Each structure stands twice: as structure tokens, then as C-alpha cells.
């Protein structure tokens, strides 16, 4: 069970850790988050009380190093840093724990929600979407644009999601225009799965990461990517049976976790109606169709 200590909390902020969140008051003696489950990626995220604009945060995996948060009064944000001195770090954490200055990652034993949302998400894949190779953790915020959004403007601050474009030479074989446009199986299976992602696990990992950035940061480009990766599967007549069954589980937990009051901005009516009711896979997403119909029947 790993720990991310905080040097201090000098500004009032709502702190997120995965799907949980806590309000911290200006100069409240808060010194971090303990009992973080090993074996998953995690995201620690912030929304300042005085500017509810720019949600921002850090993807990390405590197996890769000792991470802490320290407020920078110059850049005006909570920053993640790595402590390279193991003994200094262990000694900081032990002191803060003894003084009970840390919140406990509040996982219910029965509750597989975070595993279910991050099953295919791997820190090494996040670090290729979010390029800052000198850090082992990855910064994301509400405003970061995607490589695809930038083509249609600072490349160092971009989300390098895999570009998916249904009306592109990549998507459409010369001579198979109608076939490839109406049935995206060659784009899904040959170009994306065999070609770029290498396997369905890496495809799902990017889909799951896109969703989590959409949900936690309101990152619009991430929402676009999440829907494009759903639509590419649902629009393929030929998808491995294990991928459809896995996709139904992935989407079910994503729809289950989404705040009820954000369905208006985070769910694309056209994509979900097409995927559940018109697409080749209209009858392949039983769990997702049932939770969507019971939780968001207005959207449909």
C-alpha cells in the first residue's frame, strides 16, 4: 500500500484520487494520501476553489518511484515530483502517518470499480500519449488538445492519441470505398489492431485512458477519442467475440461511474444511438444497452 505525501496545502482545493475526492481548506494541515492500492495506475487531480477552471492532474504508478505533491506559488499549481532518496521519503511518510495527517484511499473491499476502469491502462502507454520523458508520471488538464484537434497548437503539451478518421486514405482501401466506409472491419482489424495497437489490450487501454481524461478533466479531445474508438468497433461487422464481450464490460463500468449530471456534455447522442440501435454490434452490448437505457433514456 503506497503513499503520495504532500509538502503542504497552501491553497483551498478539491483533491481527486481516482474516483474519490476530498475538499482541503487553505493552509489545512493535509500531508497526503496513503493506502493506495498497488497494481493499478492512479490519477491525483485538482480543482482550485478560487478558479474552478483548469481541472489538472497526474497519472502515476507507485511501483515506478516515490512521488509527492508540492504547491508551486510561482506556477500556481500543485506539482508532482519524484523523491530519489528512498530513506528521506520513507522518513517523511512515516512522520506524516504517525501524526495522522494523511487521508486513506477509501477503497471498499467488494468494489472493483477502479480495476474495471483501468484494466488495460498501462503507465508505459500513458507516457507515449503524454510525452514528458524526464518524469515517470504524466500531467493532463482540461485544456490540452489532441494531435488530431491540432491538425484541424503547442506540440509538447498535446495528447498523442492514435488518429482515427473514417474519411481518410488510412481508413479506406482504393477500390473498396463503399465496403470500407459501411463496414470498418479492415480499418479496425488490419490497420488499427494488427498495424498500430498490435493487440486489443493496447486498443482498450487507450479507449479507457481517453474516457478517464474526459471524465476527470472535462478534456473535450479525450471525449472525442473515446467515442471514435467505440464507433470504430461498433461500425465493424467482423470483431473477435472476446473483444465485443470485453467492450460491453468496459463501457458498462464507464457509464456506471459517469456523474449523472455530466451525461449532457460527456455522451455523444449520435454515436450512442448509432452504436446501440443501428450498428453491426447493436445486439452485442447487452450490459451497456441496459445501463444506458435505465440511467440515460433521454439521450436515447
Amino acid at each position: 500500500m503506497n503513499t503520495v505525501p504532500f509538502t503542504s496545502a497552501p491553497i483551498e482545493v478539491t483533491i481527486g484520487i481516482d474516483q474519490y475526492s476530498f475538499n482541503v481548506k487553505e493552509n489545512q494541515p493535509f500531508h497526503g494520501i496513503k493506502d493506495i492500492p498497488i497494481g493499478h495506475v492512479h490519477v491525483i487531480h485538482f480543482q482550485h476553489a478560487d478558479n474552478s477552471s483548469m481541472r489538472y492532474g497526474y497519472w502515476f504508478d507507485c511501483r515506478m518511484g516515490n512521488f509527492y505533491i508540492q504547491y508551486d506559488p510561482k506556477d500556481g499549481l500543485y506539482k508532482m515530483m519524484e523523491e530519489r532518496d528512498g530513506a528521506k521519503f520513507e522518513n517523511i511518510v512515516h512522520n506524516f502517518k504517525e501524526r495522522q495527517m494523511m487521508v486513506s484511499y477509501p477503497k471498499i473491499d467488494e468494489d472493483d470499480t477502479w480495476y474495471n476502469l483501468t484494466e488495460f491502462v498501462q503507465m508505459d502507454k500513458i507516457r507515449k500519449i503524454v510525452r514528458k520523458d524526464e518524469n515517470q508520471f504524466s500531467y493532463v488538464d482540461s485544456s490540452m488538445t489532441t494531435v488530431q484537434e491540432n491538425e484541424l497548437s503547442d506540440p509538447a503539451h498535446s495528447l498523442n492519441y492514435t488518429v482515427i478518421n473514417f474519411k481518410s486514405r488510412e481508413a479506406i482501401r482504393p477500390g473498396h470505398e463503399m465496403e470500407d466506409f459501411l463496414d470498418k472491419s479492415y480499418y479496425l482489424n488490419t490497420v488499427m489492431l494488427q498495424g498500430i495497437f498490435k493487440n486489443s489490450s493496447n486498443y482498450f487501454g487507450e479507449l479507457q485512458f481517453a474516457f478517464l481524461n474526459a471524465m476527470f478533466f472535462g478534456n473535450y479531445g479525450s471525449s472525442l477519442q473515446w467515442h471514435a474508438m467505440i464507433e470504430l468497433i461498433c461500425s465493424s461487422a467482423t470483431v473477435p467475440k472476446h473483444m465485443l464481450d470485453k467492450l460491453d464490460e468496459i463501457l458498462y463500468y464507464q457509464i456506471k461511474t459517469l456523474p449523472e449530471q455530466y451525461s449532457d456534455i460527456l455522451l455523444n447522442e449520435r454515436v450512442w444511438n448509432i452504436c446501440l440501435y443501428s450498428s453491426f454490434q447493436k445486439n452485442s452490448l447487452h450490459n451497456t444497452e441496459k445501463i444506458m437505457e435505465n440511467k440515460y433514456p433521454e439521450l436515447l
Binding site: 474519411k167 481518410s168 486514405r169 479506406i172 482504393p174 470505398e177 463503399m178 466506409f181 459501411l182
Partner: protein
Amino acid sequence: GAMNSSNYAELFNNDIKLFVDDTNVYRVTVHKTFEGNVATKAINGCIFTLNPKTGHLFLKIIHTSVWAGQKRLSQLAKWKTAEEVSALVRSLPKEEQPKQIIVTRKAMLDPLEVHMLDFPNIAIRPTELRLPFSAAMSIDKLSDVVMKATEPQMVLFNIYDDWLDRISSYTAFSRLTLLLRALKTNEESAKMILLSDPTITIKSYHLWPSFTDEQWITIESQMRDLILTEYGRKYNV
């Protein structure tokens, strides 16, 4: 974006452009079967591809053989249209290729965009104009070459005959759309107006009769009257 009443003069500028109308590509007669079910029988069709500035018409005849053993023909017809338009563009010298293709029906946008991916600098546009190009098959000589075709064939026409010797493209297009609107609203009446005087003939190399400038004014008036009458009937107004 969309071609409308606001940007109408753009049709007659010096940027090569083509209209594409797919309404006569897939044509059927609906009939009863022996068992009393309904079936269709396809007849020959055509793509109507028109340069509004020059009057050059690329009439690609769609022979019924292209539908043999195919499903969802009304869908396929849009893709076959886009395939043939793409093939026509590729067949033209670079300096003759259009800078824009305007489709008369919005359902042609995606098929044409996907077939033209190799031509990213050719703009594919819809139109808000309600153009009467469906009535092309009321032009006897166009109907005759389509129905007689025994195989896929492209036939080239000038839909304005020799009008551009005397009138501008704008005026020629206006005359063409008025003739086609009349033929669409009441074909029998429009054809009566066009041939009533036996002394005015259609040249072998033309589609329409050899009217003098004064005769065209009379004809155009008779076409307007036909259209308004018909409209009063349609709506009881």
C-alpha cells in the same frame, strides 16, 4: 459550404465546377408478380454531370447489368455515382479537372468525398437550390441514348446547344433550369410548347429547337405560365 441563392453568380466564374445529379441513376418500374407480390424491374439510368459555365454534359449511362446480383440498390446507386464521377475526374487532364463538385442531393456527399480522397483540393459541396435535373430524361435525345444503351457508355453533350454564342452562362443556366422545371411540372404541356410550330426544328447536333432571340422570349413566357398554373392547381391558391 452549401451553394444557395446568396452565392449563385459563383456558378459562372472561371473556377471549373460540375453539378452531379444522381436522381436518374437507379430507375425501376414497380409491377405485380404472378403470385400477386410486388417486384421491381430496373431500366437504364444515367448520371447527370454538368459544367454550368460551358454547358458541357458528361452523361454516364448506367446499364441495368450493373445491378445484377447486387443488394440495397438505392444505396449502391450513390456509391456507383461517386465511383463514376471519380473515374471521370481522373480521366480529365489536370487543367480540366473541377475545383468543386456540387451534388444536388445531400446523400451523395459522403460517397463522393470517400471516392475523391485522392483529390483533397476538390471541394465537395451540397446545394440549397432545388434544381430540376431529374427532368433530364424528358429531353428526348438524352432519353433515347439512355434507353438504347446495351452496355455502360459515356456520351458528351452541350446542354445549351449554341446559346452561349448569343447569351451569357448565367442566362443560359436560367433558360435551362426554366425548361427543366416546366418539363418536371407538366411534361406533356412543356413538350407541346417546345414543338407546337413545325417550322422551328431541332438541329441534328442540338437538343432543343433553333429559336430566334424573340421566339425564346415567347417560349420562356409560355414556360413560366405553365409553371404558375400548375402551382395554383397543386396548392389550390
